[PDB]
Design a protein around this ligand. Sequence first.
Ligand SMILES: CCCn1nc(C2=C(N)NON2)nc1C1=C(N)NON1
Length: 262
Amino acid sequence: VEDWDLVQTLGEGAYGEVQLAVNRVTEEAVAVKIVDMKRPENIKKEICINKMLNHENVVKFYGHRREGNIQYLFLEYCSGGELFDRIEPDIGMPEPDAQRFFHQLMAGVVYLHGIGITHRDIKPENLLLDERDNLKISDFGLATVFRYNNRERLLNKMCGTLPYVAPELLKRREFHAEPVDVWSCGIVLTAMLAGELPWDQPSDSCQEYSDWKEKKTYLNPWKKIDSAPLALLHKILVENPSARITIPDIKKDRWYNKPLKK
Ligand SMILES: CCCn1nc(C2=C(N)NON2)nc1C1=C(N)NON1
């Protein structure tokens, strides 16, 4: 119903819904996120961050119109759905698939970090798959600038999703953006490799979290994992963000570089 027709709802959420839209003439498909500014400050921030983005592992932004209160963000259609739907509960997925998705995730994250954007809500629901199963980072609704004119700014707002959030964001008034995305990348890796999340939140008041810091890897996310990716997970899920491995160093890790897939 906007030069394009809207054909199936594709997802419905808080702000609004995402529809699949076609040209009835050219036949080109795209997704359109539909936010009712009544149901404005922050959709403005989202489209603004979107206009900066151009990368093969980031959902393409095509444009925006206003049409009443109704913003329509026109976005790359990802016909493979969500990474979340390739993770079999209690099982995960074959290790070579997990590794390729992890490579593509790191490529997307290094890119955002390079232009000073942090996504702040990396999780499998926000990692979409295209026609050839290429992973694309999706939904910049919580995204923000953490570097500008080459100067870093610390974050203070708590956001994201509790099982994915780094412990510093619950403990510190201000914290660096990049290690928080790294950590959330490690929780996604765990989910791909075990088919379960290790804890509700990285709090000292969380038993499963305490067990991990005590290195009880004979318990039940970790026991399904396998020594090579587990060793990478030991470097990512480090409580102190200044000792946590960085992306250039993840690129040097042994499992990250292990040949697995045809
Ligand atoms: C299950 C919802 C699917 N979804 N969600 C989004 C999206 C949201 N929810 N916020 O920004 N972008 N975008 C999509 C989507 C795209 N971008 N292509 O197919 N589906």
